[PDB]
């Protein structure tokens, strides 16, 4: 387990506290962790990820914080060597951009937890931590939840933070996934800002090529009387009419306490029967 | 001349609109109010808002078309006929979310104007003479020159097609067929409620997509109402601007008096701009746009 910092300033004592959480659950910890909001400069934050991908005693590379700064670390990095590194990169939020360029180079990543929140907090979630070690040590996963259409598609699983996905639009770092399953999560946004970013990927022609769209934990909004009925249900009804692909909700992944580790790059199996959803992902390192 | 009021995004209370029409009357213009139907957050449904744009562009007594609000246009890009709008000969003005409408017009070869709207430029009681006089001048004069004072800017002397608008709406256009393919132009951006890291992020999308590499110069408008903290550790607009100029290959010029501010200028999107910076003294002449 390697703890790199793509671009996040974290309190000094909380990281040392999260180290004990990693060691008390059986994991060899190797930390590679300042400049303004970032844990280092662009070249140093680029080098720490490169050196972490070369240490033989390293299997899992977990990001430190997912604020902003990983897009700066795209040209100074060699994602071709990162694909051959055989490492297990996990993370979310800003770190989603790094996992797209990996999938752009045919490398499977994991969209799961990070050290900033899922390991430094005193309100540890057994759901999040157990699903993490399960995805790391099991050849298959199964994501079942309770949902409030009939789908049964199979394709390449990919996705991540919605703001980062809208940020990847038009850039060479966006994976050209043909007929896959796309999941999205975000926080502190608005249903109209969520609909706006989803229309960017639809106008760009990405949503038309996919075979299913999954909605994750879109957390913590703020509505007013000016909305006049516009909410998450108003968008979802309008989005299911605009999009030609099915839209399934209830994915337990986002900026929440409870989250699952989603392999970005594996072969998924989305199923909607009668309110019981099930997502089986296979073939991932 | 004649003007038409359209609501491409949100709605405005009827009390404020009637006061805004009186201002356009006092300044000597014939108002044609197409705003009525009201649908949730928007002033009308997507099909009704689309029909109101096609109808105002066909009225022979209308010459200028102004947008009501700019708080979310994208929902009806396919309902509109921008080939019909480019031939309509109307002078569309607006900003904020209306930048989406102006990029598709420029994609078809139509010159629009990034300027004021009914929202907070004609409904406010603290009316701005700078905004209203610059707006009336661009509509009635073939040339507009903008001069401002901004320090630490490079000495440039470029000339190209002026285009751009809201930074969030432009980064939203990345990857979409509605993004204009301006080669060697002068791009300007502005935004509000955005931390400088959100500004650098959307600017990186325009750089990674290859848009900034083709332009001749990048002009920064007003980026107001920030919220920095101690966790920035010295990060602000200056630290972002210095990192942007080190990353970008084109010169970045700041100080453009345009944005969601009381005082703003009317910038003809699609015109022929002449950018000149003389170590603090910056001048922007604009031409080749319909009057």
What's the token pair of residue A200? 């960017």
- How many of the other CB atoms lie within 10 Å of CB of B50? 19
Residue B260 annotated as catalytic: yes
Selection from A141, A90, A102, A92 nearest residue A270 by Cα: A141
**What Å distances lie between residue B206 and B30, B109, B189, CA to CA?**
40, 21, 11
B139 and B156 together in one domain: no
Residue B172 in contact with partner chain A when CB distance is under 8 A = yes
DSSP at B35: -
Residues A128 and A172 in one domain: no
Gap between the Cα atoms of B36 and B233, Å rounded: 50
Shared domain for B45 and B155, answered yes or no, is: no
How many CA atoms lie less than 13 Å away from B112 in the CB half-sphere? 29
The catalytic residue among B114, B195, B260, B277 is B260
| Chain A residue with minimum CA distance to B231 | A37
Q: In what helix (H) or strand (E) does residue B22 lie, and over which residues does it extend?
A: helix B14-26
Q: CA-to-CA distance for A255 and A91, rounded, in angstroms?
A: 11
Chain B residues close to A161, C-beta within 8 Å? none
Catalytic residues of A: 93, 185, 255
Under DSSP, the state recorded for B98 is G
Residues of A in contact with B235 (CB under 8 A): 36-37
What span, in angstroms and rounded, lies between the C-alpha atoms of B273 and B169? Answer: 22
Tell me the chain A residues in contact with residue B171 when contact means C-beta distances shorter than 8 Å: 166-167
Q: What value does the CA radius of gyration of chain B take, rounded to a whole number of Å?
A: 18
SS3 per residue for chain A = CEEECCCCCCCHHHHHHHHHHHHHCCCCCEECCCECCECCCHHHHHHHHHHHCCCCCCCEEEECCCCCCCCCCCCCCCHHHHHHCCCEEEECHHHHHHHHHHHHCCCCEEECCCHHHHCCCCCCCHHHHHHHHHHHHCCEEEEEEECCCCEEEEEEEEEEEHHHHHHHCCCCCCCCCCCEEEEEEEECCCHHHHHHHHHHHHHCCHHHHCCEEEEEEEECCCCCHHHCCCCHHHHHHHHHHHCCCCEEEEEEEECCCCCCCEEECCEEEEEECCCEEEEEEECCC
- Provide the b/e sequence for A258-268 (b: ≥16 CB within 10 Å): ebbbbbbbbbb
Residues A161 and A133 in one domain: no
Q: CA B53, B57, B60, B64: dihedral to nearest 10 degrees? A: 90
B162, B254, B283 from B276: Cα distances, Å: 13, 12, 5
- Beta A151-161 vs A180-187: how paired, if at all? parallel
In whole angstroms, how far apart are CA A53 and each of A1, A32, A97? 11, 11, 17
Taking only residues 35 to 64 of chain B, the set having a beta carbon closer than 8 angstroms to any beta carbon of chain A reads: 38, 40-41
Q: B40, A234: Cβ pair inside 8 Å?
A: yes
The candidate with the shortest Cα–Cα distance to A215, out of A189, A273, A175, A254, is A254
Give how far Cα B208 sits from Cα of A166, B81, B218, B223, B226, Å.
Answer: 13, 30, 15, 22, 25
Best A190, A196, A237 residue to mutate vs chain B (most B CBs within 10 Å): A196
Residues B118 and B150 in one domain: no
Whether residues B87 and B196 share a domain: the answer is no
The reply to whether A15 and A93 lie within a common domain is: yes
* Smallest Cα distance from A167 to chain B, Å: 6
| Strand B267-269 with A267-272, pairing | unpaired
Of the residues B83, B118, B144, the one at which a domain ends: B144
What number of other Cβ atoms are within 10 A of residue B44's Cβ?
19
Same structural domain, A86 and A187: no
B75 has a chain A CB within 8 A of its CB: yes
Strand ranges across the sheet with A267-272: A140-146, A276-282, A267-272, A151-161, A180-187, A212-219, A247-254
Give CA separation, A162 vs A80, A93, A187, A217, B62, in Å: 25, 9, 9, 11, 41
Total domains present in chain A: 2
Query: Most B CBs within 10 Å: which of A8, A10, A37, A100, as the mutation test of the B interface?
Result: A37
Task: Give the dihedral of Cα atoms A199, A203, A206, A211; nearest 10 deg.
Answer: 70
Any idea what the Cα angle at residue B188 is, between residues B186 and B192, rounded to 5°?
Answer: 175
Longest CA span, chain A: 57
For residue A142, list its beta bridge partners.
A280
Write the DSSP symbol of residue B260.
S
Tell how strand B281-287 and strand B144-149 pair up: antiparallel
- Would you give the DSSP letter of residue B39? B
For β-strands A88-91 and A60-63, DSSP reports them as parallel
A76 and A43 Cβ atoms separated by less than 8 Å = yes
Catalytic residue among B88, B96, B112, B277: B96
Is the CB of residue A50 less than 8 Å from the CB of residue A56?
A: no
Query: What span, in angstroms and rounded, lies between the C-alpha atoms of B168 and B265?
Result: 19
Can you give the length of chain B in residues?
291
Same domain, B167 and B213: yes
> Are the CB atoms for A58 and A39 separated by under 8 Å?
no
Instruction: Write out chain A residues lying below 8 Å of B38, CB-based.
Output: 228
Spatial CB neighbours of B128, under 8 Å, sequence gap ≥ 6? B121, B262, B263, B264
Q: How far, in Å, are A180, A260, B171 from residue A209 at the CA level?
A: 8, 26, 22
Q: How far apart are the two ends of chain B, measured CA to CA in Å?
A: 11
Residues 6+ apart with CB under 8 A from A275: A146, A147, A148
Min CA distance, B11 vs chain A (Å)?
9
A54 and A132 belong to one structural domain? yes
CA separation for the pair A186, A201 (Å, rounded): 15
Tokens of A169: 């639009």
Closest CA to B168 of B250, B223, B117, B107: B223
β partners of residue B243: none
A163 lies in which domain range?
A: 142-285
B231 and A200 within 8 Å at the Cβ level: the answer is no
Q: What is the rounded radius of gyration, in angstroms, for the C-alpha atoms of chain A?
A: 18
Cα distance between residue A16 and residue B69, in whole Å: 50
A89 forms beta bridges with A61
Same domain, A202 and A132: no
Nearest CA among A70, A240, A200, A140 for reference residue B74: A200
- Is the domain of A9 the same as that of A77? yes
* Domain stops at, among B114, B144, B174: B144
Instruction: Indicate yes or no: CB of B205 within 8 angstroms of CB of A9.
Output: no
Residues of chain A contacting residue B72, judged by C-beta atoms under 8 Å apart: 192-193, 196
Give yes or no for A224 touching B (CB within 8 A): no
In the listed set B83, B110, B144, which residue is the last one of a domain according to the structure? B144
Q: What gap in Å lies between CA A56 and CA B230, rounded to an integer?
A: 38
What is the H or E stretch that residue B99 is in?
helix B99-107
- Cβ atoms of residues B177 and B245 within 8 Å: no
Which of B211, B191, B194 is CA-nearest to residue B70?
A: B191
Task: Return the residue of B nearest to A195 by Cα.
Answer: B75
């Amino acid at each position: 387990i390697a703890i790199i910092a793509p671009g996040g300033y974290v309190p000094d004592s909380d990281l040392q506290r999260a180290i004990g959480v990693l060691k008390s659950r059986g994991y060899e910890v190797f930390n590679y962790v300042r400049h303004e909001r970032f844990a280092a400069n662009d070249e140093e934050r680029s080098r720490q990820i490169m050196e972490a991908a070369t240490n033989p005693d390293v299997k899992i590379v977990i990001a430190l914080r997912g604020g902003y700064g990983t897009t700066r670390l795209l040209h100074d990095l060699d994602f071709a060597k990162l694909a051959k590194s055989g490492k297990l990169f996990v993370g979310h939020s800003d770190f989603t951009v790094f996992e797209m360029a990996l999938l752009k180079h045919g490398a499977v990543s994991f969209s799961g937890p990070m050290i900033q929140s899922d390991f430094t907090r005193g309100d540890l979630s057994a759901f999040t931590l157990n699903h993490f070690d399960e995805t790391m040590t099991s050849p298959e996963t199964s994501v079942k939840w309770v949902s409030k259409p009939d789908v049964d598609v199979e394709g390449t699983l990919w996705g991540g933070n919605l703001t980062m996905l809208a940020h990847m639009a038009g850039t060479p770092w966006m994976p050209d996934i043909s007929g896959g399953i796309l999941f999205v999560e975000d926080i502190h946004e608005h249903p109209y800002r969520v609909e706006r970013m989803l229309l960017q990927l639809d106008e760009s022609g990405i949503l038309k090529k996919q075979k299913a769209l999954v909605l994750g934990h879109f957390s913590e909004f703020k509505l007013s009387d000016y909305d006049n009925g516009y909410d998450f249900n108003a968008m979802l009804s309008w989005l299911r009419s605009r999009l030609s692909i099915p839209v399934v909700t209830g994915l337990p992944f986002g900026h929440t306490k409870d989250k699952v580790t989603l392999p970005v790059g594996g072969r998924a199996h989305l199923m909607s029967k009668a309110g019981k959803i099930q997502l089986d992902i296979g073939d991932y390192p």
